[PDB]
DNA sequence: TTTTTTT
Ligand SMILES: Nc1ncnc2c1ncn2[C@@H]1O[C@H](COP(=O)(O)OP(=O)(O)O)[C@@H](O)[C@H]1O
């Protein structure tokens with residue numbers, strides 16, 4: 001049931017012994033439905049992983065961290081304390097030893113250390129140290145034009161720069177030992193549903209600011225946020241918070257405040273949600289952690305149904321189901337430099353305990369990455385500031401008419417890091433081999 | 437500056 005373009009990639013991946021493939025293209029191009037066809041072909045032989053919970057859900061797999069039991073921190077290069085093989089008689093060891101294919105969805109969101117940790121974990125567990133991924137055939141799928149992987153400041157950023165030169169999956173050293181065969185998908189849903197939108201976005205992918213004039217002519221209407229069924233996106237947290245606060249205060253009903261418990265050193269700028277979180281029944285929220293039992297994910301939108309002491313009920317938009325939310329603990333990690341060997345090392349210095357809930361009438365563009373919305377309004381505020389931020393904001397909706405802007409987009413807000421441009425020009429040949 | 441993954 002694949003299109004001709006999808007069948008081309010399906011056959012190029014399944015009917016060759018080559019062990020490393022990348023299937024890439026813009027959103028709506030068929031990557032996920034091709035993944036399902038690959039799963040049906042391989043079924044027992046393949047393990048499906050993704051870097052986020054919502055992507056793992058859409059890929060019918062698990063997160064990379066959960067499968068390999070990686071810690072939620074910087075994965076230092078082949079470091080035995082961050083990358084631990086499974087025990088001698090564990091189910092995970094059997095799963096890795098018998099694995100033939102690893103399917104990795106949304107690979108553009110896989111940070112370089114995550115991918116490298118996969119490589120090392122597979123090599124060590126399978127005892128094939130000289131073969132990339134321990135001889136497992138890796139099928140990467142994803143768009144290469146997204147928000148960059150998260151890289152905190154301080155010694156962590158310096159480590160990643162020193163070790164890999166950057167955060168992207170194509171900067172991993174494993175590509176120096178195996179060639180990545182590339183297969184592009186061009187035909188998108190959007191090309192059929194709104195070709196004008198698809199043409200504008202293609203030019204913006206190419207960094208062409210010319211496209212902004214038509215986009216601004218079509219989409220600028222400052223009152224677009226006042227319309228029903230409209231989620232508001234902002235570049236920064238402060239403006240989204242003010243939006244949410246206004247909606248919360250206008251919502252009739254009795255409020256309940258959830259007070260975080262903070263221990264040790266945890267600056268409030270690093271808080272994953274508000275320390276004093278006030279909620280009302282019916283408030284639009286977004287969940288902030290992945291359920292270990294798979295009933296909800298970080299990024300799930302929903303509505304507050306019940307509010308009680310350290311426990312609330314949320315009705316999920318995704319499936320209409322009810323989930324009960326209790327506090328989670330986040331850790332603050334600091335990396336200290338040893339200054340005599342290379343030797344940075346993590347230490348947990350603080351903890352933050354709070355219900356994993358944030359108000360969601362307004363969201364940041366970063367937080368809305370990976371959601372598909374029916375209608376969005378972009379309240380630009382002081383402006384977009386990150387690689388891919390404009391493109392990700394625009395692509396949250398299916399049609400240009402579903403989008404509105406508070407003001408014209410400026411050419412300074414169309415941002416792409418040159419390393420991503422360089423990698424794209426090299427994967428237009430059909431195969432890519434990282435130098436060194 | 438500026439925001440976000442991962443348990
Ligand atoms: N071969 C196909 N047959 C039927 N529907 C398809 C096919 N390919 C894509 N679609 C539809 O197009 C939409 C986008 O496809 P998807 O696999 O989600 O693309 P992407 O992974 O790039 O977002 C999906 O909702 C899917 O229903």
Ligand SMILES: [Mg+2]
Pocket residue numbers: 031032106
């Ligand atoms: Mg996809």
